[PDB]
Amino acid sequence: TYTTRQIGAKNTLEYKVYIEKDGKPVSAFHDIPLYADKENNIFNMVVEIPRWTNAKLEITKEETLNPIIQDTKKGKLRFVRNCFPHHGYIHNYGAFPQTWEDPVGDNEPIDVLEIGETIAYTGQVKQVKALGIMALLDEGETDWKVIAIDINDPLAPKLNDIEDVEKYFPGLLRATNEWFRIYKIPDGKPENQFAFSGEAKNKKYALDIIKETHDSWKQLIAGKSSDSKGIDLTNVTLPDTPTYSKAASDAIPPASLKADAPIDKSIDKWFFI
Amino acid sequence: TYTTRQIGAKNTLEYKVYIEKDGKPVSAFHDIPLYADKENNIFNMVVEIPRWTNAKLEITKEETLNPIIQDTKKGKLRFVRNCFPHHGYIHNYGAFPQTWEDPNVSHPETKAVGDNEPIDVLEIGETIAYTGQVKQVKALGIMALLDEGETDWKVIAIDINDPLAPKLNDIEDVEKYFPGLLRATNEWFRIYKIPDGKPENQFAFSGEAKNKKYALDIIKETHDSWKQLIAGKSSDSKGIDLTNVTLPDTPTYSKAASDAIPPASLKADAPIDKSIDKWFFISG
Ligand SMILES: [Mg+2]
Ligand SMILES: [Mg+2]
Ligand SMILES: [Mg+2]
Ligand SMILES: [Mg+2]
Ligand SMILES: [Mg+2]
């Protein structure tokens, strides 16, 4: 059973979320199997950012057991701004564990947009099916975005491939295109671009990419990658890896006893861009 | 100074929010002056629903001193559903006090009776408001919604404390600084009850946002209807509670109605059913 352990108050620099298995912290990058069911291509997704929130929470590749923490820019907490007509992130946003875009690769686990009705929680491990994939170019890096749905979603049986997203969620792909193009403009960064004229490639294509990034991660965790520089490969479930260390689980502090900190009112603002 | 008195937990049937002056409840419908500054057309807006929320909170017409309570549908808490690409309400949503959309006459602009409540207000500024807030706003224009076949004007307004307020003087300025907002507003009020099984709404003037002058004229009309209502001279006041603590010349004035309100009993927000998360895709 997977749960979460929160350190600190939400919306502060001290905030961290670890994934626990049966009460013990494990690596959110390395210890959560990519497949919940390999034969049927059901994946475990680690959720970082709930739909309609702003705080840019991510699995941290540099910290032991890779807890989810809020991204920072020169000491300041990073929040994506509201870009009309969107409110924060427009997907449940996260990543597939045991994947790594070998750097061209963006040096992170492959990103996942989960499109189901229910709002997810930070550190949630949910099971999803892949429907398709888009290739965003962000600052000279290939930044793949897998489109997926929670297998528990009421609509999941009716969704198998990318064309079904058009049928059941008309306009979401357009919005996704737009969002990823403009979402850094309020930060003073340029508009992003997509490969393939912004087309979402189908499930078969998505599976090939996901598989590649899993194989890269297998080389990484085995200690055989060219440059694992700045990535903590500590794990507690893979006994034959060079960086296995069960003691890392017990070194994690206990759950914090703290309410969400307030978010600066500036983050409310709607930008028309 | 206006403050709030909350009874119970948000998102429950017991939840109530009274507006207080000097730590004592007053009627949110009748006792808050329409104008903060009559000469400069600065209005007091009562906020019911914060931007990007769902709970359909409103001034309760039939309850003494008209606290804000969550509306219900056949006994169950009513939440407006998320209609793609929108999340809940896309404005800070509320009303002008001391107004009434008269339900007893056909309004000439829409050829429809009024919806029997205060004139509604869409406040478009950057900061998310809170329920029971009284803020000061300037009117910028107005749209003629027919909501389930009833006259249901929506005033477009901005908080005078918004950084952009000095630059927003008339409806054309909304399109300049908030491009797409008025079109989205038209869409939102057309479609928002489709997930409830209701028909699409419509607008008079093919959804045109009329200007500030037009808005002021309609706000006056609804204020005048309210003056008749509160004097006890409406042909049909619809069981509205007219109790007030500030209008001595009215037959329902009662300073001591305030004392009878229970003390605050604020509890943490109750959880909302996960179904309210759902994003409805209406067309395409
Ligand atoms: Mg990522
Ligand atoms: Mg990426
Ligand atoms: Mg109203
Ligand atoms: Mg209405
Ligand atoms: Mg109304």
Q: Which sequence positions of A are flagged as catalytic?
A: 89
A265 close to B (CB below 8 A): yes
Strand pairing report for A111-114 and A142-150: parallel
Could you give the 3-state DSSP secondary structure of residue B177? helix
Task: State the nearest Cα–Cα gap between A141 and chain B, in angstroms.
Answer: 29
Nearest alpha-carbon partner for B240 in B224, B229, B228: B229
Chain B interface mutation, best of A117, A172, A178, A269, highest count of B Cβ atoms under 10 Å:
A117
The DSSP letter of residue B110 is T
Quote the minimal CA–CA distance from B96 to chain A in Å. Answer: 24
Integer Cα distance of B69 and B14 in angstroms: 8
Q: Find the CATH number of the domain harbouring A168.
A: 3.90.80.10
Any idea which residue has 């991660």 for tokens? Answer: A217
- With a CB cutoff of 8 Å and minimum separation 6, the contacts of A21 are A1, A2, A31, A237
Alpha carbons A131 and A114: distance in angstroms, whole number: 10
Q: Select the residue of A118, A170, A270 nearest B284 (Cβ to Cβ).
A: A170
Q: Could you tell me which residues are beta bridge partners of residue A185?
A: none
CB contact under 8 A, B181 and A84: yes
Pairwise CA distance, residues B236 & A202, whole Å: 62
| Cα distance between residue B255 and residue B250, in whole Å | 12
Q: Per residue in B22-49, is it b (16+ CB within 10 Å) or e — as a string?
A: eeebbbbbbbbebbbeeeeeebbbbbbb
CA of A136 to the centre of ligand 1 (A): 12
Residue for token digits 């929010």?
Answer: B17
The CA distance from A181 to A175, in Å, is 10
Q: How far is CA A261 from CA A272, B250, B267, B272, in A?
A: 27, 47, 18, 21
CA angle B34/B35/B40 to nearest 5° reads 150
Cα–chain-centroid distance for residue A184? 17
Based on its alpha-carbon atoms, the radius of gyration of chain A, rounded to whole angstroms, reads 18
B274 vs A172: CB contact, 8 Å cut-off? no
Q: Looking at the DSSP assignment, which residues form a beta bridge with residue A20?
A: A3, A25
How far does CA B213 lie from the centroid of its chain?
20
| 3-state SS record for chain A | CEEEEEECCCCCCCCEEEEEECCEEECCCCCCCCEEEHHHCEEEEEEEECCCCCECEEECCCCCCCCEEECEECCEECECCEECCCCCCCCEEEECCCCCCCCCECCCCCEEEECCCCCCCCCCEEEEEEEEEEEEECCCCEEEEEEEEECCCCCHHHCCCHHHHHHHCCCHHHHHHHHHHHCCHHHCCCCCEECHHHCCECHHHHHHHHHHHHHHHHHHHCCCCCCCCCCCCCECCCCCCCCECCHHHHCCCCCCCCCCCCCCHHHHCEECC
Q: Is B16 helix (H, G, I), strand (E, B) or coil?
A: strand
Ion ligand 5 neighbours (CB, 5 A) are B 115, 117, 120, 152
Residue-level length of chain B: 284
Can you read off the two tokens belonging to residue A232?
């903590």
C-alpha R_g of chain B: 18
φ and ψ of A76, to 5 deg: -105, 135
Cα separation, B174 vs B181, in Å, equals 8
* Secondary structure of A74-87 in HEC code, one letter for each residue: CCEECECCEECCCC
* Pairwise CA distance, residues A162 & A175, whole Å: 15
Q: Quick one: tokens of A115?
A: 């499109």
Nearest to B252 by CA among B265, B237, B266: B237
Annotated binding site of A: 78, 106, 111, 143
* B83-112 residues touching A, CB cutoff 8 A: 84-87, 90
A265 contacts in B (CB within 8 Å)? Answer: 127-128
Tokens of B107: 């309004």
Which of A90, A117, A171 is the closest to B284 by Cβ?
A: A171
Active-site pick, B15, B18, B35, B89? B89
In A, minimum Cα distance to B275 occurs at: A118
Q: Which two tokens stand for residue A256?
A: 């914090």
B178 inside 8 A of chain A by CB: yes
Sign of CA dihedral A61, A65, A68, A70: negative
Return the residue in A53, A164, A265, A270 with the most chain B beta carbons within 10 A, the one to mutate for interface testing: A270
User: What CA–CA distance (Å, rounded) separates A82 from B86?
Assistant: 12
DSSP B166: G
Q: How far is A254 from chain B (nearest CA, A)?
A: 25
Please name every residue paired with A95 in a beta bridge, in sequence order, or none if there are none.
A46, A111
For an interface test with B, the pick among A164, A272, A273 (most B C-beta atoms closer than 10 Å) comes out as A272
Residues in A closer than 8 angstroms to B86, CB to CB, are 85
Q: What is the 3-state secondary structure (H, E, C) of A200-232?
A: CECHHHHHHHHHHHHHHHHHHHCCCCCCCCCCC
Nearest CA in chain A to B92: A268
Q: Do B180 and A85 touch (CB under 8 A)?
A: yes
**What contacts B110, CB < 8 A, 6 or more positions away?**
B144, B146, B151, B204
Asked if B17 and B6 touch (Cβ cutoff 8 Å), the reply is yes
On whether the CB atoms of residues A47 and A123 are closer than 8 A, the answer is yes
Measure the CA dihedral A84/A89/A91/A94, to 10°.
160
Q: If you measure CA to CA, which chain A residue comes closest to B188?
A: A85
Distance of alpha carbon B198 from alpha carbon B90, whole angstroms: 20
The residues near A228 (Cβ < 8 Å, ≥ 6 apart) are: A220
| Domains: count for chain A | 1
| Residue A118 Cα, gap to closest chain B Cα (Å) | 6
DSSP reduced 3-state for B190: helix
**Residue from B185, B135, B184 nearest B158 by CA:** B135
| B274 to A86: CB separation less than 8 angstroms, yes or no | no
| Closest by CA position to A54, among listed B87, B64, B188 | B87
Q: How far is the CA of B123 from the centre of ligand 5 (A)?
A: 15
Residues before each break in chain B (C–N > 2.5 Å)?
Answer: none
User: Mind telling me how many Å the CA of B186 is from chain A's nearest CA?
Assistant: 13
CB A53 within 8 A of CB A140: no
Phi, psi of B169 (to 5 degrees): -125, -30
CB B72 within 8 A of CB B13: yes
- Separation of CA B245 from chain center: 21
The domain in which residue A122 lies consists of: 1-273
What is the rounded CA–CA span in Å between residue B9 and residue B15? Answer: 6
Question: A201-229: buried (b, 16+ CB within 10 Å) or exposed (e) per residue?
Answer: bbbebbeebbebbbebbeebbeeebeebe
Q: Which long-range contacts (CB under 8 A, 24 or more apart) does B225-230 make?
A: B225/B99, B225/B100, B225/B101, B225/B102, B225/B114, B226/B98, B226/B99, B226/B100, B226/B118, B227/B98, B229/B100, B229/B102, B230/B30, B230/B98
Say what the alpha-carbon torsion angle B230, B236, B237, B238 is, to the nearest 10 degrees. Answer: 180
